[PDB]
Structure 1
Amino acid sequence: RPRFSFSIAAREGKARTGTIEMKRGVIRTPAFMPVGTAATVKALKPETVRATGADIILGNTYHLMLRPGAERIAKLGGLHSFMGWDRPILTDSGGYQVMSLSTKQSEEGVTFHMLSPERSIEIQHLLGSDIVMAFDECTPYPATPSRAASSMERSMRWAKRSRDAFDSRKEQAENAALFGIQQGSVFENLRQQSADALAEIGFDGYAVGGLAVGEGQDEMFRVLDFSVPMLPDDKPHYLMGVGKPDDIVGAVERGIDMFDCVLPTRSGRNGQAFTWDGPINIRNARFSEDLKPLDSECHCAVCQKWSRAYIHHLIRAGEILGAMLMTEHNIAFYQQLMQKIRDSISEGRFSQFAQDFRARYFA
């Protein structure tokens, strides 16, 4: 089992499919990562997360540093042992959540309590993270060229510090991997600058940051169109915070290999279930006596046993079992979507799938 090895087994247009091999397991790409804020994928046992098909989950550095604390988790044995997930875990750097949830921004780091590239990397280390994200700053939207160019440059300076900070910890540099994050809002030249700086520094994977921050899909794809190709080709492409079904498909078409989103998890607890015929709000009075499963084709355990009527009942009653079932279904649905995407690329029919998917999903 190598530390980190990405191989592409099939392509079609900019879309790719393959695997990322790591010490804790193999990750099939394009991949969807369930989000594990607070050392738990909301409402699911790790085994249930694994059963839906997930090969890797995302853990948040911001939230865990506060509660229960990095050193503490490290003392208990690391995040994997703490939550009971023994497969790869990717941990965000915290830059995104800090400037979103709690601010004194300088060059050393950020204050809300100082969080610096150096500290971020150590935190991800104590957690026992498999894929460390470089500490950065997600530029808000909109953002004048100047602003977008300031954040980006500072980010790129943090990228270098993140890299060195990572390479100094012998046991970390040898067991985990490091991804750099490109920034630069919706500006072509800024994206390019960022890409070059990152490639110059060297990273195991490259994420596209600062998107899906409010610019809408059209814009996002447009930006993705020139940005993704800037990143090296023989390395994984990670689109951060993107997860609407339709978004994943388009991003994969444009070359993205990894996704992470709370939509599946959060949407579920609230009453939205994803189906191949588009989403549905199970709370609707029209499912009250519907004996059909959430989705007619879904292979998840929830769609094999319970009806929409039952789940409708659970959700309107505010029962925990309701959130459990909805969430298992949504994540399972997302993983089936990723499976259909990998398979279609391996067969050279991704283009048609993408087309058949949108027709039905939006019919």
Structure 2
Amino acid sequence: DRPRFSFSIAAREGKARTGTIEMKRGVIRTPAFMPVGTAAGADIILGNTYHLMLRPGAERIAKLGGLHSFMGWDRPILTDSGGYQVMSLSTKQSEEGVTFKHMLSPERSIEIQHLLGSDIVMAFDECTPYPATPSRAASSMERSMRWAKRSRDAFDSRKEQAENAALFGIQQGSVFENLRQQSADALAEIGFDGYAVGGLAVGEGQDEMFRVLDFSVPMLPDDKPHYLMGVGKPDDIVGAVERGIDMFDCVLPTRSGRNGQAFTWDGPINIRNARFSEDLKPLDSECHCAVCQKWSRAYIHHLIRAGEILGAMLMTEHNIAFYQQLMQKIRDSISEGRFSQFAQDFRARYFA
């Protein structure tokens, strides 16, 4: 019988790691990509806390048997704490939490995630806007750390949650090394099952994001998983793995899939472009997905140009599969000690 939570590192290359997270509902191979659950293989999917709390509401999801039953997915599910989305899509902040057009607090966030039944629960934090002054970044991070402790206590007070789920803390501090360190120290003192790097993929760009990861990831406990929230493009994922990240989520595969963009080893392509109208090659030359086994760029181009939902579905299936093949290649290369070479080869071809 699998444990509630156990992370094991099987192999390393530089800062990169590959291994497994064992949970009651399944094993998660790392580095992992975690796709949106409602998108359409993956070891864990995402539940959309913000949407679900509004429609149909967390209490209603619980009445229906929880997210696993509702979505027909019996493996692990990760949920965010909801605040990022409230601040992005809705607001009034206070030490208690956020009110918006209801009150979302650390305690309420944890309870919502309990009612949804997720396996990996995120602490309720504040994703500091970018750019931020040192003072504002510090005040924001300090509040997030107080909220992390409140999240910890709320999670621990719910027996079913404490015994069956896992809780990740989220590091903040914007782009400032000293604040990232204080945040890491605060989170480690509280103690979490995993640690996320928050506050990135918010407009800073890849060079700056990588610079922040360079010093931020080593601050987190080495023996726990590291989750980079909101990342990202394939090249962002590769560089983040090079910097010690184990888990990823991004809206790109689905957003791109619904908007004519396909990921390939030769970079992204816009399938609507006329240059694909007579292209009999599959979306990607090496991809093993069902779409690439059967249909051409020309046919998918045709479907999308005709407004056929089948086209968007095939694009999305391909993009999700591409991301999973990327993660498999990353895991295999780290395990074989050839990840550095893989990263180099990947970049040379993707950006050719």
TM-score of the pair, normalised by structure 1: 0.95
**Cα offsets for 1:270-322 (capped at 9, x unmatched):** 01101101110000101111111000100000000111111001111121111
CA distance in 1 between partners of 2:116 and 2:168 (Å) = 16
After the TM superposition, which residues 168-317 of structure 1 pair with which residues of structure 2 at under 5 Å, given as runs? 168-317=157-306
**Cα offsets for 1:46-82 (capped at 9, x unmatched):** xxxxxxx111011121111000110000000000100
Aligned Cα RMSD in Å?
Answer: 1.0
Shift of 1:38: 9.6
CA distance in 2 between partners of 1:154 and 1:205 (Å) = 20
The runs of at least 4 aligned residues of structure 1 exceeding 3 Å deviation read: 36-39
- 8 Å contact from structure 1 (residues 37, 63) kept in 2: no
CA distance in 1 between partners of 2:5 and 2:311 (Å) = 38
**Cα offsets for 1:146-186 (capped at 9, x unmatched):** 11111100000000000000000011100000000000100
CA distance in 1 between partners of 2:318 and 2:212 (Å) = 32
Q: Which moved more, 1:315-324 or 1:13-22?
A: 315-324
- 8 Å contact from structure 2 (residues 198, 229) kept in 1: yes
CA distance in 1 between partners of 2:324 and 2:213 (Å) = 23
Shift of 1:36: 3.3
CA distance in 2 between partners of 1:146 and 1:61 (Å) = 30
SS across alignment from 2:11: strand
- 8 Å contact from structure 2 (residues 79, 118) kept in 1: yes
CA distance in 2 between partners of 1:25 and 1:37 (Å) = 19
- 8 Å contact from structure 1 (residues 38, 60) kept in 2: no
SS across alignment from 1:20: strand
- 8 Å contact from structure 2 (residues 39, 254) kept in 1: no
Shift of 1:37: 6.2
- 8 Å contact from structure 2 (residues 272, 304) kept in 1: yes
Q: Which moved more, 1:133-142 or 1:56-65?
A: 56-65
- 8 Å contact from structure 1 (residues 160, 201) kept in 2: yes
Shift of 1:325: 0.3
Distance 1:37 1:190, change over 3 A: farther
- 8 Å contact from structure 1 (residues 38, 64) kept in 2: no
**2:29 matched residue in structure 1:** 28
Q: Which runs of 5+ in 1 are unaligned?
A: 40-52
Count of matched residue pairs: 350
SS across alignment from 2:28: strand
- 8 Å contact from structure 2 (residues 107, 151) kept in 1: yes
Distance 1:37 1:114, change over 3 A: farther
After the TM superposition, which residues 6-85 of structure 1 pair with which residues of structure 2 at under 5 Å, given as runs? 6-36=7-37, 53-85=41-73
SS across alignment from 1:19: strand
TM-score of the pair, normalised by structure 2: 0.98
Q: Which moved more, 1:343-352 or 1:310-319?
A: 310-319
